[PDB]
Amino acid sequence: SLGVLAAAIAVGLGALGAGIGNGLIVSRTIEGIARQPELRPVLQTTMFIGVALVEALPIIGVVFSFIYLGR
Amino acid sequence: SLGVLAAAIAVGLGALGAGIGNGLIVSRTIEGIARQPELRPVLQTTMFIGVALVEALPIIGVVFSFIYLGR
Amino acid sequence: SLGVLAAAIAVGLGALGAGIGNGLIVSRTIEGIARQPELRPVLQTTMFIGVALVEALPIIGVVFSFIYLGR
Amino acid sequence: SLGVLAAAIAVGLGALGAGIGNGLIVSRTIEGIARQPELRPVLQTTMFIGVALVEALPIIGVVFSFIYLGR
Amino acid sequence: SLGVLAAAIAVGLGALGAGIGNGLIVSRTIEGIARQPELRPVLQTTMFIGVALVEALPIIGVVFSFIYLGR
Amino acid sequence: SLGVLAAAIAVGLGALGAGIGNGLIVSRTIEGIARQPELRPVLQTTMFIGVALVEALPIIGVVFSFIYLGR
Amino acid sequence: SLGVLAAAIAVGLGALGAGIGNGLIVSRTIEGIARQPELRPVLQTTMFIGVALVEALPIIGVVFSFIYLGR
Amino acid sequence: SLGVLAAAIAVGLGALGAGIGNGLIVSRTIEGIARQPELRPVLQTTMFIGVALVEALPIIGVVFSFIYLGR
Amino acid sequence: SLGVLAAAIAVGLGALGAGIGNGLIVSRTIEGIARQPELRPVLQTTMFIGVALVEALPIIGVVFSFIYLGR
Amino acid sequence: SLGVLAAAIAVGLGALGAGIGNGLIVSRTIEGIARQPELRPVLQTTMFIGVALVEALPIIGVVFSFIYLGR
Amino acid sequence: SGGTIIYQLLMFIILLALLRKFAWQPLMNIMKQREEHIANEIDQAEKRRQ
Amino acid sequence: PLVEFLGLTFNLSDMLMITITCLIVFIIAVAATRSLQLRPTGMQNFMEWVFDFVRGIINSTMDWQTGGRFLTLGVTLIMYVFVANMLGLPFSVHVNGELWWKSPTADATVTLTLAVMVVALTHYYGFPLKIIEEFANTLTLGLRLFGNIYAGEILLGLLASLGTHYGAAIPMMVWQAFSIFVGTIQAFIFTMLTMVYMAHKVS
Amino acid sequence: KTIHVSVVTPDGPVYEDDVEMVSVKAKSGELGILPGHIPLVAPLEISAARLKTQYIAVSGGF
Amino acid sequence: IIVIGRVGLSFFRKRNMPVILDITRLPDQPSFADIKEIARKTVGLFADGTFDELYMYYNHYVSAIQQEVTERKLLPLTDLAENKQRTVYEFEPSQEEILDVLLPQYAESLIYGA
């Protein structure tokens, strides 16, 4: 019964953390390509590895959310 | 009974995280085009790219909340 | 029973996310028009586009709150 | 029973979101009028429409809290 | 039974929102009068209309928390 | 029985909001002190009326918390 | 009964608010010493009275936590 | 029987903390490589050890959540 | 019983507040000794007294959590 | 009974606070070594004593979580 | 038969009508800008050589 | 709205939507590529504009010599995902059975196998932390497109039922314009992140 | 590594050497300069320039 | 009119024209101090909102024989030319404050070079 709510807070807090982290990274790379627009690939690759990190910990959280759901 | 507010906290924390991330990205885009108007097409392009990236992981929380309401 | 509490926290977290995101983007566009006052229409049009794209997910949170209230 | 707790948590989260968002908008517009004080009416009209948005989504949050209290 | 806890979370979240909003407004106006000292009356009038403007919805949240305590 | 929890969270949320608001206003008023010394009286008068503004709602919160504990 | 966790959540939210406020004000005293290290007496005395201001309402909250624990 | 809820709030709060910390670190390091490009490798190594710290505390949080759900 | 939940919560919010406050004070003293390194000992010593000042009250919350676990 | 989620909320709030504070410290140390690269060892040594100073209290929160789980 | 099908299809048609009054003028001008740009690149190239 | 499968192994309706989107993409491709014209007009300029758009994206991520190969995978991938997102909006019919012909991308298995096909291709053309990051980016790409189409599908459907059961034209109109916006943005971020991982593994 | 200082007046050059630490103070506050510093401009207050030693008092100053 | 010299000062007093600033009896080899006080008065008098633009008039040393007369626009700095390596700085208070303190010094250096 409570495993549904457990999976739900897990995916909700993972979504909140990934949203704030991705928002910070892409925000400052907007102002990075606005200050110096010729640095777009060297900003972009580091942006995507940061997106990979800040999603990949909530991604293993949301992978664990289904085994929270089952129990 | 408990799955309803499970789905509700899931979609609520998703909306919170997407709102903060979208706010950070869009605010920095418009201050960047306020710094110079000559790059507003590429900054709007990377704006919508960023909005998709921060609105992506909360909507998987939304559809998982529908799954939680299913069970 | 729990559906009205579900509906209320869903619309409340949607209001919190939309309020923070709209506050960020509107505050940066008014400091942008304070920095360069001849850029006011472009800045406020991109600001209203930002209002729509930060209030995308809270608005769907509102109608899913009505779903949660109905059950 | 739960309807009054629902109505109050909706009003509380809407008040917190409106407080933070309108605080950001009003704070940045008084520092913007501190930078260039000849732009008083433009800054005041833009802060009024921005505050109108940031308040008006918790306004419908508050009237939804009223129909939550009715149920 | 839950009406007292409802009024409590309502007044508390309205207090936290009003605290952060008034902190932002008074903080940016105190750095604004720290920058241009001869702009003190205009900055104070806009600051007080901003403080009333951001505590508009928390005080109606308080006077709705009273009837939440009743109902 | 939950009136004690109600009063306690009212005091706690008021303390948290007052702490953030006073932290913001005191922090950049000492930034304003550190930039220029000669405006210490006007910075401190605007500081303490800001303390009054960000603490007033909190004060109301703790009085209403005693009303809630009496209920 | 649940007055023990009432008292504890009062202590916790007072600690969170005092931590954020004290962190902001003492951090920007460090930033002001870094900008200009010859006004350390006036910066530290305004720091400590701001510390008194941010700490005051959580200490009032924690003595009411003592009156809450008993009940 | 609340170990599933235990492990899930542990993973969720660890994911939120790791998301905000990684977002701050990666966002400031892409601003660091944006304002000057010629020591991107110097910035990346300290960025990755900071990511290692701010996730290595929630990694042991996730392992402790596994032994929470085991009990 | 529920005093364990009380003590843990006090310990957790004390750790969260101390973490954010200590992060602010240490991060801004990194920037402070990064811009002017010849000042480093005096601002790191007032950083340490700010550290003791920001974590004074969470240690009090830890002691009160021992009291709550005893109850 | 509820000692397992007591242990888990302790670990979760400690991880969230350590994540935010550690992210602030590491982000400011990489922008510090970005804007002037010659102070990398000094800034890393004070960054490491700062992160040890931050995570001192969540680690004792984790061992208090151990004795909460044993309860 | 269900009622939602013709209802949302009718409003999709009237949404395409509103987007036709609003939107045929931008994208046809973008396509005409691309066509005139590539015709001038080619036309210019042909003219100069001659 | 259950999973209607005529065969036990695989969903029948998803196969129908995959076949209809493959045929409509193939016929718009051969209608845009009818004949050779050195002065572009009509729809051949549109196909060349999409072609140079994909090329521009490749040029943003990688060197043109390395990524020149991927251009014809990328253009059919962006057009395929584009039409696959926009098919769910006009009809979305309900039959007396479980469900028939919603959209392909709303099915989670379709989008997850398309994402793992993308990553299998970029492994084919191309230590525990790296492989868990690989499985992380596969499932977050698939879940990205699946969620951001499936939530809009359910909302549009809900709006359709609220209108038919008992005045509510403009909310679903604003949502449906926002949903074709979500469809084109999701197609573009899908093909762009595809080319990002292709550039990350090639060079 | 060292950085190259050259204090320049309209009347002519005054000082030119290689100094490790330059500790000028701006209108905002102090600045401690090491080799590899970010490109920045800051107006100097009417005070001495601490070069680590020889101290140079500038007037006007930028 | 802002004269530097007694010959132009007596010229515009014979012809009854208004002369605000006057500086008289410079050395043969002038340093930056005397022209610093009168150039500070000139640029600050532009900053008061009085002049709204001003021009310089002097003899450009082309050669030992030529000495051509140049009209050069001092303020506003509209004809400012870009250098070879356009680099970006980190403006330490902000760029507007450093311009507020730096552009009068650029105008004073223009006056002293002329």
Numbering used by the authors:
A (entry chain c7), B (entry chain c8), C (entry chain c9), D (entry chain c0), E (entry chain c1), F (entry chain c2), ...: 2 to 72
K (entry chain b1): 7 to 56
L (entry chain a): 6 to 131, 152 to 191, 198 to 234
M (entry chain H): 2 to 53, 58 to 67
N (entry chain G): 115 to 228
Sentences from the paper on this structure:
Adenosine triphosphate (ATP) synthases are multi-subunit protein complexes that use an electrochemical proton motive force across a membrane to make the cell’s supply of ATP from adenosine diphosphate (ADP) and inorganic phosphate (Pi). Proton translocation across the membrane-embedded FO region of the complex occurs via two offset half-channels. The passage of protons causes rotation of a rotor subcomplex, inducing conformational change in the catalytic F1 region to produce ATP while a peripheral stalk subcomplex holds the F1 region stationary relative to the spinning rotor during catalysis. The F1 region consists of subunits α3β3γδε, while the FO region is usually formed by three subunits with the stoichiometry ab2c9-15.
We determined structures of intact ATP synthase from Bacillus PS3 in three rotational states by cryo-EM. Three conformations corresponding to different rotational states of the enzyme were identified by ab-initio 3D classification and refined to high resolution. The 3D classes contain 45, 35, and 20% of particle images and the overall resolutions of the corresponding cryo-EM maps were 3.0, 3.0, and 3.2 Å, respectively. As expected, the most striking difference between the three rotational states of the Bacillus PS3 structure is the angular position of the rotor (subunits γεc10). The structure of the ATP synthase, with three αβ pairs in the F1 region and 10 c-subunits in the FO region, results in symmetry mismatch between the 120° steps of the F1 motor and 36° steps of the FO motor. By comparing the positions of equivalent c-subunits in different rotational states, the observed rotational step sizes in the three rotational states of the ATP synthase appear to be almost exactly 3, 4 and 3 c-subunits. Bacillus PS3 ATP synthase is found in a conformation that has been proposed to allow ATP synthesis while ATP hydrolysis is auto-inhibited. In this state, subunit ε maintains an up conformation and inserts into the αDPβDP interface, forcing βDP to adopt an open conformation (lower, dashed box). The cryo-EM maps show that a clash between subunit ε and βTP blocks the central rotor turning in the direction of ATP hydrolysis while it is still free to turn in the direction of ATP synthesis, which could explain the ability of subunit ε to selectively inhibit ATP hydrolysis.
